[PDB]
Amino acid sequence: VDDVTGEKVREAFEQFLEDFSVQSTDTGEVEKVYRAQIEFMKIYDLNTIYIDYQHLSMRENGALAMAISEQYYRFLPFLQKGLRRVVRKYAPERVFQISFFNLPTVHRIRDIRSEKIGSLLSISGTVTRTSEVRPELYKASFTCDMCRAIVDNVEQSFKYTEPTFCPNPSCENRAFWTLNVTRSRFLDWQKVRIQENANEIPTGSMPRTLDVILRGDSVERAKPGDRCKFTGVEIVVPKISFLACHVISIGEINELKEMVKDEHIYDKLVRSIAPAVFGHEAVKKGILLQMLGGVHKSTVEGIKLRGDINICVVGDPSTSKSQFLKYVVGFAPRSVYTSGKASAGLTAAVVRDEEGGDYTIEAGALMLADNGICCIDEFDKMDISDQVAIHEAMEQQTISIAKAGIHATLNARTSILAAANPVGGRYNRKLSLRGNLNMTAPIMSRFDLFFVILDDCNEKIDTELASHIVDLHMKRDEAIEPPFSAEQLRRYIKYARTFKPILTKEARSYLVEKYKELRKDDRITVRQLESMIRLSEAIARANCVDEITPSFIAEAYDLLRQS
Amino acid sequence: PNVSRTIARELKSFLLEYVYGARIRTLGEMNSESLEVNYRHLAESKAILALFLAKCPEEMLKIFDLVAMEATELHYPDYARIHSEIHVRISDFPTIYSLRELRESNLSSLVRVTGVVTRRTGVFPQLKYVKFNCLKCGSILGPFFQDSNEEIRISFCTNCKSKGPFRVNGEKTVYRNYQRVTLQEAPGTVPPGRLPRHREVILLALVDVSKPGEEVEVTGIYKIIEANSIKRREFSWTEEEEREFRKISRDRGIIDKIISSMAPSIYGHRDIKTAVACSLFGGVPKNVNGKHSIRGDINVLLLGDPGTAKSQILKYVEKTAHRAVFATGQGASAVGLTASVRKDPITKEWTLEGGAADKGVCLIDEFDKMNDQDRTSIHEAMEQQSISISKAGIVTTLQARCSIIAAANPNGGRYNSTLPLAQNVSLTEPILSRFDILCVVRDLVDEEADERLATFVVDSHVRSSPIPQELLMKYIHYARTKIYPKLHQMDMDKVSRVYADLRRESISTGSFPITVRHLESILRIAESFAKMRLSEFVSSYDLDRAIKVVVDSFVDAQKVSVRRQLRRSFAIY
């Protein structure tokens, strides 16, 4: 019933591609950019086009998009034949790849049913493992047993096929034709592993993973251990796999412009980054400034520097310092939490694949997050191997894996949130931080800020804390409630993240005196100076001011003096 | 086609009219089967043959071997009794491609690619044909199988019409000689942020003449690359840049300018970068009558406080240098010293591969945090510039003459200056003796250092006289591949006089001695400074800087009680 519907949908798709030219001068009326896109790729001949689904959803009141959207695998050669006919008529070794992107709905891996078999789908998640690219047979040149005649056979992406009848009536046999590789176009075929994101896992469930196939020039773009979003077709494999065609490295203005014009935003921000915790404004300040970094870019030579903020919390037992740990992971999308004591895995472990007996690098705790916060609870009960792997991952913003003869290093950006405890639990003011923390100097270094919490019997704030604890124990109390929700705070974090501010001369002249004042207390070296420099642009982004004044760096100087 | 018949008689007339007679007599007398043809020769003769070789080399190779065997048969009688086929070696390919430019358009064509060979396999079984035994009726049936797929499942018998279990019969089957090496992209020419790719190469008719862990140039066809010719000889220097390098090296004492050009991010101090520059520039390897191989590399060891920069500098050095890979690693380490013999699961065999820099520099971060295998492999590579493989049926001694730049931290964070370095670090003396230069930093306090260090590191972050970086990295490759400065016995004996004072004074006041390895180290540091100075030989005052480099490393690697040695070395300072 689709044999006469395929030519009509081919005519509709080529009418959509033929009736839309470019009239985009002076930001006037809109019309699609496809003919100039074909005219641009005429020189390079890659034929790996990108067609927006939002731009295709306006024709036939969306009904053309809804009919293509369910019968995509049954309409795909008609669409590529219509694309071939329009490039054969508008332009004079021929492979084609049509990619669809920007779907209005983002589907998870747990909502995949069998009602969407063959339809298009948007799958978001994180890549766990990757497979080295291999040639895809696609179409082969079979030769006959007696005719010696060439036949161009088209595979169906299932398994090694074979024709049935010879086209030339010189023979009618069904014996074994022989394969030929000259006249058989080959496309790189990669198989990667996608898995469920850490913020959308059900309670007690397992993060179920799946294998997704990818062809064309969409390969060698997906970086391992990065949140990715694919758009493709659900194809069954003799298992329900996936075929992707589009790759992207993923991971209101009336409210944002209203929130950047006032003057008391930062004071509600330090008490709204953790509304369940009573007290501890310094820890909330470091947690709020530890979500967004800055000035890492490129050194005047050619090496990247550590532009991130490392935050470590210490103190006595039974405090609310783990509550922040439970908040970050419940609010930040780029946040991976580990227990620490029960943990190579931290620094991205190595696992083998039997095809070539080849290694792949699993991110684990260390490389799972991108421009985010990796939070490690119980940092002092870990071993020596994972802590020197953390130190090897921290001196240079990269991680190295040396296994089976191959050495591979990669750029992983993370902000360590380390929760530690003393050797005896109770924090004594008798000695230094080094003998009480019980860890070596190097792993103690490259940490921008330390938060020490000590408790005692001070009734005036203690009765308020106990009343807040017993008032919290009810069905959704308003006591916890912040001055504004997280709804505008997420887009504010993203808007401050894409800002990129810079320092001045007065700030540098006050910074040299501040480094002398910090070194007069004396360990303190260049790393703490780099930590307060990185916290300066983070507080500049949080207060949304471009050129920084030294008065906002004075609060960071007071924060360093408070620690 | 019959068009090959007018091609054949064209090149049959070409070989008698060009050096090809000398080429055919050298391949015939050495009972050789490899014939050498430059691409430029026949390309100047006939560009249509070059276009046919660039388009269809598989059908172009069916004419070459036949006309070579015909020329060898009329030049030498009965040559077909011993050698049936003679192949050709297509060299001098003009368009050298990279491994990341291998695309679908380069299929079924000639391509010259650069790389590094690893996990080489020699004379390992390959499959061309098969047979299968059908167990139900017990019958035989056979097709073809090449070198890319796993195997073509046969599940339909002739008369059984059954799905029974089938067995592989290779007891009537083809004879294949297979030698495939996993080639990889070199780390000295990879763009930053990207990863080096890797391919599989087939070697047939050219086995065990390649060295693993070295740069190689292979010309073959692309389909999996089927190599035709191999070359173990190989951002480069040109004619317009080579005259200005001698003009720059002749004026204004460039050794200190290269030192100031080494660290642009921080101010630092010259003790780390002097050892770093002399280790990257290196010395010269010399042998006497084929034996007594001295190590031309310089392995430096950094020590000091955790806060101080040790990784940034190493990373910068690696970026600046050629074939320098920053392996680092602690827990990850795996197979030590990149040299390993191991089994491989793709086809179930034993192979050897030297991991990832035979001429390069390897960078190790956190030297105290390693296991037994990667300490013993680097101790073998520091004792000798070679790693031996003596297992799984193979015995190969591969080049491991790579310079070592290692960084470490002491036990406890603090350096603890009232104790020697042997009690400070967990390492012992023979692994410390391979490292000639031991640079160590300490802690500092007053407004002066606060006025300079913080301002230079904030100047490095507020911005997004010395030698520029591009000219410096081109000068490294230009001086390391062309000159070999020796020494002349005219007045060099004076250093044997001063070593005679300097050895004796280490017994009476110091506890640690000075040996002949320090003399070999200062001669290497002086010839490295002569290499950086681009001279014909080592000068008389290069040894003054060499003895200053060894005094501020050996005296600084001890207690405060060798303080009299700070003034005892002041007479030669």
Author numbering:
A (entry chain 6): 103 to 194, 260 to 405, 451 to 463, 512 to 603, 606 to 784, 794 to 834
B (entry chain 2): 201 to 218, 226 to 412, 414 to 431, 450 to 460, 474 to 595, 599 to 706, 756 to 864
The authors write:
We previously demonstrated that deletion of the Mcm6 WHD supported ORC–Cdc6 interaction with Cdt1–Mcm2-7–ΔC6. The previously reported 3.9-Å resolution structure of the WT OCCM aligns very well with the mutant 3D map.
Helicase loading at DNA replication origins depends on the Origin Recognition Complex (ORC), Cdc6, and Cdt1 (3–7). Orc1-5 and Cdc6 belong to the AAA+ family of ATPases, while Orc6 shares homology with the transcription factor II B (TFIIB). Here we employed a previously reported Mcm6 mutant, which is missing the C-terminal WHD (amino acids 839 to 1017) and is referred to as McmΔC6 or “mutant Mcm2-7”. Here, we report two cryo-electron microscopy (cryo-EM) structures that capture helicase loader–helicase complexes just prior to DNA insertion.
